[PDB]
Every structure is written in structure tokens, then in C-alpha cells.
Design a protein around this ligand. Structure first.
Ligand SMILES: [Cl-]
Ligand SMILES: [Cl-]
Ligand SMILES: [Cl-]
Ligand SMILES: [Cl-]
Ligand SMILES: [Cl-]
Ligand SMILES: [Zn+2]
Ligand SMILES: [Zn+2]
Length: 270
């Protein structure tokens, strides 16, 4: 279980992930309000948060996102959306290790790391300016699904490039690296990683392939389309690799609908 306060926070940040699915948001003119035309980010809209910078998917990249500023919550928000071909990723993606240069022994999944590396230089330049304009604000890095994997790696790297207190909200994330990488990220702290029932996406890549999750795990145990209460989240410390969502069994495409329902229908904007 969690406190009401924590639940309210978790139900809030996911709405920035929801916004990242909307082409209208990630191609918005800078200064425009974030908005979700299907009504799945009402609390974001209530803050009046505006876009400071954005980046679109295109012919050269499947990753889209934005940097926004939330003057209600004193937060600079970096949101990532990854490929929306996620069923195909579960069915048929191949996973490859790479050395991201983050920590001793640490290896990351090449696809996810390559996605961050493509956008890193400009995002780092832009965050310097946005934080200079809002110098007492926190940095929150957020995503859902494949975007949550990119968010995890971005956060990890940003914490060594001037943002050590950056917060990560990674909803429905795949695993992103090996045991050494997971341990290093876990020790940075400020990590909020979520899974839902038997969602197959956080089960990949597999433990047997050497990949490990960041801990703790916030495991939402309520069903699809049910409101999450304080008793519907289990907090798992990662001491046992097969506690939590991994314990529900090998990943199945027949469980895929569980991927969509993390407090709200996160991907409605696609
Ligand atoms: Cl709020
Ligand atoms: Cl592009
Ligand atoms: Cl998705
Ligand atoms: Cl070391
Ligand atoms: Cl479910
Ligand atoms: Zn709320
Ligand atoms: Zn334990």
C-alpha cells in the first residue's frame, strides 16, 4: 500500500506521459499550453503548464517529447514518448548490449540508449537554459512504455551532467540494462518505476538475458479500467528478482491490454 499523498502524486505525473502521445503537444509552438484532446491529462492542464521545447517523431526517429514548465508544482518536466509499435516490440524485437559509459560494468540496451544519444546534446543545452529561467525548480523525467525506458537512461545520464536530484517517473518501463546499471540507477535514488498486473512490457528484456530493473517497483495490482486506490499498489524492494510483475509469468501478447492502464488510459493520444 501507499499513502493518499503518494497515490495522488503517482496519478499526477503519468498525465505528463499521457501528454507525450499527442502530436499536438510535441509539435506545439514553444509557449503553448499542454493539452490532451481526449481528456486524459486534466491535472496537467489545471497547472497551466506550457511547452519550453519539443521534438517530434519523423522519418529519422521514433522518439518524440517535450520539456515543459509547471509553475504550480515548481517542476521542469522532460517527457519522452517512444515507438508506438509496442506490440511488435514484444513479439519480435531483438535486444543488444552496448556500453553507455555511465558506470563500471554497466551495459544498456542499444536501442534505448541510441534513442537518448540522438537527442542528448540538444536536450542538455536546452535544460541548462530552462533551469536558468527557473532556478529553484525540480527536474522530473517521465515516460510510459518504451518512452519510460528512454526516460530512465536520460535521467541516469542527466544526474551525472548537472542534475543529480532529477526525479524519474517510469510507467510501464522495459528493463534498460544489466545488474550493474540497475544497481547504479537504484543508488541515485528518486526513482518511481511502475508496473501493472501482468503487463508484458516490463518483463522484457528477460532476466535470463542479464537484464535487471531499477528498484523499487510500484506494482499496481488492480485490473484494467479500475480506479487505483491506496491498497492497490504494492511496493517491492527488488531483493527477489521474481517478486512483482515478473512473478506473474513469462510475457504474453494476450496480456497486452494491461500495458495501457496505468491510472488512466495513458496512450489515448496516439
Ligand atoms: Cl498538481
Ligand atoms: Cl527528426
Ligand atoms: Cl504505448
Ligand atoms: Cl566500481
Ligand atoms: Cl490486468
Ligand atoms: Zn490529484
Ligand atoms: Zn527485501
Amino acid at each position: 500500500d501507499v499513502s493518499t499523498s503518494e497515490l495522488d502524486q503517482f496519478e499526477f505525473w503519468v498525465q505528463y506521459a499521457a501528454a507525450s502521445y499527442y502530436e499536438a503537444d510535441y509539435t506545439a509552438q514553444v509557449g503553448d499550453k499542454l493539452s490532451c484532446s481526449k481528456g486524459n491529462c486534466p491535472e496537467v492542464e489545471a497547472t497551466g503548464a506550457t511547452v519550453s521545447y519539443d521534438f517530434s517523431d519523423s522519418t529519422i526517429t521514433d522518439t518524440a517529447g517535450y520539456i515543459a514548465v509547471d509553475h504550480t508544482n515548481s517542476a521542469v518536466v522532460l517527457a519522452f514518448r517512444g515507438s508506438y509499435s509496442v506490440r511488435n516490440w514484444v513479439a519480435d524485437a531483438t535486444f543488444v548490449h552496448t556500453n553507455p559509459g555511465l558506470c563500471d560494468g554497466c551495459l544498456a540496451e542499444l536501442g534505448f540508449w541510441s534513442s537518448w544519444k540522438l537527442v542528448r546534446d540538444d536536450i542538455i543545452k536546452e535544460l541548462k537554459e530552462v533551469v536558468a529561467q527557473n532556478p529553484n525548480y525540480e527536474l522530473v523525467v517521465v515516460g510510459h512504455s518504451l518512452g519510460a525506458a528512454v526516460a530512465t537512461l536520460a535521467a541516469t545520464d542527466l544526474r551525472g551532467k548537472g542534475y543529480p536530484s532529477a526525479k524519474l517517473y517510469a510507467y510501464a518501463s522495459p528493463r534498460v540494462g544489466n545488474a550493474a546499471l540497475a544497481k547504479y540507477i537504484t543508488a541515485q535514488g528518486n526513482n518511481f518505476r511502475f508496473t501493472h498486473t501482468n503487463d508484458p512490457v516490463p518483463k522484457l528484456p528477460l532476466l535470463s538475458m542479464g537484464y535487471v530493473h531499477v528498484s523499487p517497483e510500484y506494482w499496481i495490482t488492480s485490473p484494467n479500467q479500475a480506479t487505483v486506490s491506496t491498497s492497490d499498489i504494492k511496493v517491492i524492494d527488488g531483493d527477489v528478482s521474481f517478486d512483482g510483475n515478473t512473478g506473474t509469468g513469462l510475457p504474453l501478447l494476450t496480456d497486452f491490454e494491461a500495458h495501457i492502464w496505468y491510472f488512466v488510459q495513458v496512450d489515448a493520444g496516439k
